[PDB]
Coordinates of C-alpha atoms and ligand atoms in Angstrom, one line a residue:
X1 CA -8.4 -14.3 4.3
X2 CA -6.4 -12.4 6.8
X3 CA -4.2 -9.2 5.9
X4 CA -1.4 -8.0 7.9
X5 CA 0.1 -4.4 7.9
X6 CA 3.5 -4.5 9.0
X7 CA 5.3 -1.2 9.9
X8 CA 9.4 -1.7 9.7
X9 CA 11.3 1.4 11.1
X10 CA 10.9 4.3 12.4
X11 CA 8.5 5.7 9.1
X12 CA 6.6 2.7 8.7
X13 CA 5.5 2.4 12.5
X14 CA 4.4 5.8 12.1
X15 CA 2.0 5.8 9.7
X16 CA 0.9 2.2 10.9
X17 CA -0.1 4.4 14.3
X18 CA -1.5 6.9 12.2
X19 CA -3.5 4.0 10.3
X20 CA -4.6 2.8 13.7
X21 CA -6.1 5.5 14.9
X22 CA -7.7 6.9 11.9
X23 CA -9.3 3.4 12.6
X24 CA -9.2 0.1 10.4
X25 CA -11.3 -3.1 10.7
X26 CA -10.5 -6.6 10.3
X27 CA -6.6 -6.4 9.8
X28 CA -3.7 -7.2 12.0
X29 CA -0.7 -4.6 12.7
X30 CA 2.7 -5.9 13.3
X31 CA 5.4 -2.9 14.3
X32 CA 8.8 -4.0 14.2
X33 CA 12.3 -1.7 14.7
X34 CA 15.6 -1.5 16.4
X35 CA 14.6 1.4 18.1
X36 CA 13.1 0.8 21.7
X37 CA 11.8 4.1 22.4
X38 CA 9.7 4.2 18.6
X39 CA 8.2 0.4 19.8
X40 CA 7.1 1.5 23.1
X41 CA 5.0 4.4 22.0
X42 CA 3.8 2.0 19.0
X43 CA 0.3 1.3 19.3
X44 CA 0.0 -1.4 17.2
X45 CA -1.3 -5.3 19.4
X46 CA 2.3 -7.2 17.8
X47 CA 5.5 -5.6 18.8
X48 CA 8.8 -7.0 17.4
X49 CA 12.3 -5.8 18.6
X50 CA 14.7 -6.4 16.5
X51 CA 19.0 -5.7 16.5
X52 CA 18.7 -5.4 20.5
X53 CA 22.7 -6.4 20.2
X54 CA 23.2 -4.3 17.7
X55 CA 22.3 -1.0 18.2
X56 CA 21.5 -1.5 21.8
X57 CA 17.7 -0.3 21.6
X58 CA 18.3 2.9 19.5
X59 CA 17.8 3.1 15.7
X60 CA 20.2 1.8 13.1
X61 CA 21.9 5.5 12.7
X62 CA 21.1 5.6 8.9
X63 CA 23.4 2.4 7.7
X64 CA 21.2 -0.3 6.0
X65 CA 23.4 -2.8 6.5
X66 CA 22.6 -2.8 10.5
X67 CA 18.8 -2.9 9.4
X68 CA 19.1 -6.0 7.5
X69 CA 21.4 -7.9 9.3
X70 CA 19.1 -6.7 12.8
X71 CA 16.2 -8.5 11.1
X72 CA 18.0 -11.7 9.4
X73 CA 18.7 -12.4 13.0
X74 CA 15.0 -12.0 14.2
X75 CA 14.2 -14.1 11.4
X76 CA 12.2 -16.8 13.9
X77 CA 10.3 -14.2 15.5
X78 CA 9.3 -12.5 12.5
X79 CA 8.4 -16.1 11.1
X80 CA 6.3 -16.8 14.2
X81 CA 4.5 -12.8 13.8
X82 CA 3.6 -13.2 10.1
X83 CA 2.5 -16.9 10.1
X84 CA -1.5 -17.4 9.3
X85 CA -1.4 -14.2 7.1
X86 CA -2.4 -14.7 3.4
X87 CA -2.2 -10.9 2.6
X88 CA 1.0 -8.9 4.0
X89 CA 1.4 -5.4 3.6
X90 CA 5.3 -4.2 4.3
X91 CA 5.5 -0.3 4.5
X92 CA 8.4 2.0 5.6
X93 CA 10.7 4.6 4.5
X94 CA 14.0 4.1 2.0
X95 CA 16.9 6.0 3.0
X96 CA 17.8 5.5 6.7
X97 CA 19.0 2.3 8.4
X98 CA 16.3 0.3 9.9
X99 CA 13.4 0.6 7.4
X100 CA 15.9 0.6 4.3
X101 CA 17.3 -2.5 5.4
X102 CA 15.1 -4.7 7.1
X103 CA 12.1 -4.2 5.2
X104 CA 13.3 -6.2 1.8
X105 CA 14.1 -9.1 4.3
X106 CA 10.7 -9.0 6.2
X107 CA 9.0 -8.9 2.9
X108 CA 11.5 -12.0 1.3
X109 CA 10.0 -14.1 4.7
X110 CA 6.9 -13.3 4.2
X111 CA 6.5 -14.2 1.1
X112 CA 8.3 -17.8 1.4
X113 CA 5.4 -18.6 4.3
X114 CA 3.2 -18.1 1.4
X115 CA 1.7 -14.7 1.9
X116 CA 0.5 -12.4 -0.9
X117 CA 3.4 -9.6 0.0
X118 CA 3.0 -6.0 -1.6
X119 CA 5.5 -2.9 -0.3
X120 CA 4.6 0.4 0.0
X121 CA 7.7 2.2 0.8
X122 CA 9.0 5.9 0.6
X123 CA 12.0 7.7 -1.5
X124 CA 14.0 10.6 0.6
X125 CA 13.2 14.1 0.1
X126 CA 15.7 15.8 -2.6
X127 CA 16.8 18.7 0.1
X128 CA 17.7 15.0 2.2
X129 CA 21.0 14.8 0.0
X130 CA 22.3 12.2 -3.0
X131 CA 23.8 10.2 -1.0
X132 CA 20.7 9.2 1.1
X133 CA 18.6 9.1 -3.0
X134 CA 21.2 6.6 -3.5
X135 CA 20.4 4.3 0.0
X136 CA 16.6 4.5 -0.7
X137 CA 17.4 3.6 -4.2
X138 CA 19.4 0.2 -3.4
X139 CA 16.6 -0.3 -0.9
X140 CA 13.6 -0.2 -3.2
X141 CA 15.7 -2.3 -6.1
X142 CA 16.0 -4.9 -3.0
X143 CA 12.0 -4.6 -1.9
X144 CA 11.4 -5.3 -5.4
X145 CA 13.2 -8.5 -5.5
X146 CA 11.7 -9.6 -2.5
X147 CA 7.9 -8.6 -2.7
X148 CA 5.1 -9.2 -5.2
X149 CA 4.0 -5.8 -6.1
X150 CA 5.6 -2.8 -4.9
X151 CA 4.0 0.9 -4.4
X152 CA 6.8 3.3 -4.1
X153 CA 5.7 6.7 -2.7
X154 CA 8.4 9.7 -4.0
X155 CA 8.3 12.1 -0.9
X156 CA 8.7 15.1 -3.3
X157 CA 5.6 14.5 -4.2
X158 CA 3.9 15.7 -0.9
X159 CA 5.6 19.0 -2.2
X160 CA 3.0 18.9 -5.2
X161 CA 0.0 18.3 -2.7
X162 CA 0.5 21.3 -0.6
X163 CA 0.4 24.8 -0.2
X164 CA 3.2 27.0 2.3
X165 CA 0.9 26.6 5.3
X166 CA -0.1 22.9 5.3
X167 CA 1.0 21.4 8.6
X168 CA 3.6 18.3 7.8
X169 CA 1.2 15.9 9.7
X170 CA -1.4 17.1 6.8
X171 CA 0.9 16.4 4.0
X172 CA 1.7 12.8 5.7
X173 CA -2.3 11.9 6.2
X174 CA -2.3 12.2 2.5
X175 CA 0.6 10.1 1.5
X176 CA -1.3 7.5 4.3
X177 CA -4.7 7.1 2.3
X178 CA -2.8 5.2 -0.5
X179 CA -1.9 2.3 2.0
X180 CA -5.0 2.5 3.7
X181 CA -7.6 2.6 1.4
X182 CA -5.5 -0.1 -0.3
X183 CA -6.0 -2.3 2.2
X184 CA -9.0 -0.8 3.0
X185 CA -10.4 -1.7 -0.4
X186 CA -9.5 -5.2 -0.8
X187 CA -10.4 -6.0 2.4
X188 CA -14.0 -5.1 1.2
X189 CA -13.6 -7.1 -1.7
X190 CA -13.0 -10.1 0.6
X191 CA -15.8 -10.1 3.1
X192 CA -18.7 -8.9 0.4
X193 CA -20.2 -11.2 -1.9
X194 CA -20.9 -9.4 -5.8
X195 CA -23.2 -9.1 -8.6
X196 CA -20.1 -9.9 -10.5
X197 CA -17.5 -11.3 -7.7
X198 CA -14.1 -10.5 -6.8
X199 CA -12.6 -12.4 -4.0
X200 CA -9.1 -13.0 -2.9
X201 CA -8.0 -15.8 -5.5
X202 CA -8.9 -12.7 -7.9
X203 CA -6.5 -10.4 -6.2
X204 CA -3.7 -13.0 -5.7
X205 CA -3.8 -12.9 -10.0
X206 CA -3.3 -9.4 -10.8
X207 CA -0.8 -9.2 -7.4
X208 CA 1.6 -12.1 -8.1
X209 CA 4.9 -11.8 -9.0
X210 CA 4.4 -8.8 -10.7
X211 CA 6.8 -6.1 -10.0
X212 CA 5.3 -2.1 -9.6
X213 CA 1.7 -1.7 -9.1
X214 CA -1.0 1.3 -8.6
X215 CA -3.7 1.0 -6.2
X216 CA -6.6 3.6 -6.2
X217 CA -10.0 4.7 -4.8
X218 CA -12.5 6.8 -6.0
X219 CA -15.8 8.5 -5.4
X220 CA -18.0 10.2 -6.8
X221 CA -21.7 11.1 -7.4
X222 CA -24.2 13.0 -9.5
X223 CA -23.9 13.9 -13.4
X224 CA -21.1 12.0 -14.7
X225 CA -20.4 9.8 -11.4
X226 CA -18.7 6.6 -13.1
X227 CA -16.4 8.4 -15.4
X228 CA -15.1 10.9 -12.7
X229 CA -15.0 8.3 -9.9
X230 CA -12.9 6.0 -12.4
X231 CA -10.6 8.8 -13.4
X232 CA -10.0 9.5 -9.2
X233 CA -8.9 6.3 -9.3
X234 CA -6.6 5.9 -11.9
X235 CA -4.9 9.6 -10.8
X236 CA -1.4 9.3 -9.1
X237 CA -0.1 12.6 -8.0
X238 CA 2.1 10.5 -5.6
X239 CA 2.7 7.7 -7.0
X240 CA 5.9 6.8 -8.9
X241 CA 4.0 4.6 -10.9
X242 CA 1.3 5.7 -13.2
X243 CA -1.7 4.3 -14.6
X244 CA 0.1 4.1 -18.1
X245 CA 1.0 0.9 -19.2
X246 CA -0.4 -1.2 -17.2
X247 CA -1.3 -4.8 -18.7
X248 CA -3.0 -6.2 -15.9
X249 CA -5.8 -4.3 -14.1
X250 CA -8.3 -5.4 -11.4
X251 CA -11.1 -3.3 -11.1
X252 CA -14.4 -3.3 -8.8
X253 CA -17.4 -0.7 -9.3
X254 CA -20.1 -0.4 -6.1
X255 CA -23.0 1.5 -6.5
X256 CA -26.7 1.6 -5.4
X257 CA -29.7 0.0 -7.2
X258 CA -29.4 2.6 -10.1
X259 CA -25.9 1.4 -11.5
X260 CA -26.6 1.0 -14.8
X261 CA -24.7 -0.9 -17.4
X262 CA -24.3 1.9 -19.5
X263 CA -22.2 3.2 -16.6
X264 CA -19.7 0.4 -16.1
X265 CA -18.6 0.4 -19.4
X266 CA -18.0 3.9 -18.8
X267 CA -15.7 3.8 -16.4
X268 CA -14.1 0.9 -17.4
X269 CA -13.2 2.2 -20.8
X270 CA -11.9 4.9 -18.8
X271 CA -9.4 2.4 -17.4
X272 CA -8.4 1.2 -20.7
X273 CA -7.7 4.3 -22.3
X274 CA -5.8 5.6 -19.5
X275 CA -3.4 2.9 -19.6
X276 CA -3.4 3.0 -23.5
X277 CA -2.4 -1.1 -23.7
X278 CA -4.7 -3.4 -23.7
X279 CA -5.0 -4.1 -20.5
X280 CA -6.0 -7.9 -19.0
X281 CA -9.1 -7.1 -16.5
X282 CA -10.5 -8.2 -14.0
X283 CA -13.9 -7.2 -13.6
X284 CA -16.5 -6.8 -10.5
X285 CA -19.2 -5.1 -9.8
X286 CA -21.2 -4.9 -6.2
X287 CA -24.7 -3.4 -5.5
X288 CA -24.8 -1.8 -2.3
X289 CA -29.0 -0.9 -2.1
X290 CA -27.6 1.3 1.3
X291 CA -25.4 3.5 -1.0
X292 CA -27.4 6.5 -2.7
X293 CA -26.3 8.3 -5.7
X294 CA -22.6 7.5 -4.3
X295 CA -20.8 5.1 -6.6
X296 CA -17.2 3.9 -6.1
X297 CA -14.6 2.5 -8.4
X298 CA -11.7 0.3 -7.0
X299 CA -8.9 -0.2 -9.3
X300 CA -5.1 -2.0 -9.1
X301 CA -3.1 -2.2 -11.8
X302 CA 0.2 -4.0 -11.8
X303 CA 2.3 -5.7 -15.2
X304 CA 4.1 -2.6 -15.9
Ligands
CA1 CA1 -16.3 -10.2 -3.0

């Protein structure tokens, strides 16, 4: 299967560059934005410029309606960037221009060629103002009409991860893993053949058409590995959507030759206490003989 990660304004590109150079295997990056400066310093391998008549090469000045119409307009060339992708993953930031506007209609096409399309988009900061609260907010109601699950990242929430002195690229490396070991995690799932298999037509289940969603990793090792490991990955300090009534969870465990049974139940009881429902699982489990006393729990949960 082959995932895309597609950066739309200024935000998104961003943290695709930061994604690229923390270093990611086996998925394609796709930068697109109105602003000719932000593309040129992009390192992603698929550059799309977008609005050139509109804003002339600069950004979209913070009015969404520019954003949207920049892309509907570029509809061809986004067409002809996405196609061959079963897995697209749309990120960028709600409340300015570009990313607020065009990202609900790069998502909408890339979901009508028939890719699996989740969001992970930003809200404003609260010192940024109401007014730009209330942009982000239209923009995520119109990413979540467009995508099939959407992870929506509050930026006050880096304010709950930090202490005085943490440099702002710190706080943003954070707010990066949730993307990345995403996509980092069921891209594993793809490629590696389980005790108890999960492959894409697994993920395509608990993903379609299914509104908010929660995507976790976690590891852990020694005493109580499987319960702590499963608990890291149900834990959302910035995530607007919690493990908590979730209906539909898909959830891998991958540990060394000494997983024992005992230990999956563990964690995935975990799982379905957490989101006290019953929830509709999915369940895979991979030995990795290479891994010590590491295990690690992969879990998204979506049917909110
Ligand atoms: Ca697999």
């Amino acid at each position: 299967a082959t995932l895309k990660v597609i950066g739309v304004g200024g935000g998104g590109n961003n943290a695709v560059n930061r994604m690229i150079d923390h270093g990611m295997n086996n998925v394609e990056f796709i930068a697109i934005n109105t602003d000719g400066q932000a593309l040129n310093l992009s390192k992603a391998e698929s550059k799309i410029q977008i609005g050139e008549k509109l804003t002339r090469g600069l950004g979209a000045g913070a009015n969404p309606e520019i954003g949207k119409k920049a892309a509907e307009e570029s509809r061809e060339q986004i067409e002809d960037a996405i196609q061959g992708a079963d897995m697209v993953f749309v990120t960028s930031g709600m409340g300015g221009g570009t990313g607020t506007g065009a990202a609900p209609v790069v998502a909408k096409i890339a979901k009508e060629m028939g890719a699996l399309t989740v969001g992970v988009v930003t809200r404003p900061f609260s010192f940024e103002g109401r007014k730009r609260q209330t942009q982000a907010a239209a923009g995520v109601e119109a990413m979540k009409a467009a995508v099939d699950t959407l992870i929506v990242i509050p930026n006050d929430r880096l304010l709950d991860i930090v202490d005085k002195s943490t440099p702002m690229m710190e706080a943003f490396k954070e707010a990066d893993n949730v993307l990345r070991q995403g996509v980092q995690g069921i891209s594993d799932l793809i490629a590696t053949p389980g005790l108890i298999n999960l492959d894409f037509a697994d993920v395509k289940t608990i993903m379609s058409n299914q509104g908010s969603a929660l995507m976790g990793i976690g590891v852990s090792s020694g005493e109580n590995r499987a319960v702590e490991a499963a608990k890291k990955a149900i834990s959302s300090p910035l995530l607007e959507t919690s493990i908590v009534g979730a209906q539909g969870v898909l959830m891998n465990i991958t540990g060394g030759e000494s997983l024992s049974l005992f230990e999956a139940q563990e964690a995935a009881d975990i799982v379905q206490d957490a989101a006290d429902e019953d929830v509709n699982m999915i369940f895979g489990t991979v030995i990795n003989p290479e891994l010590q006393d590491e295990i690690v729990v992969t879990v998204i949960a979506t049917g909110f």
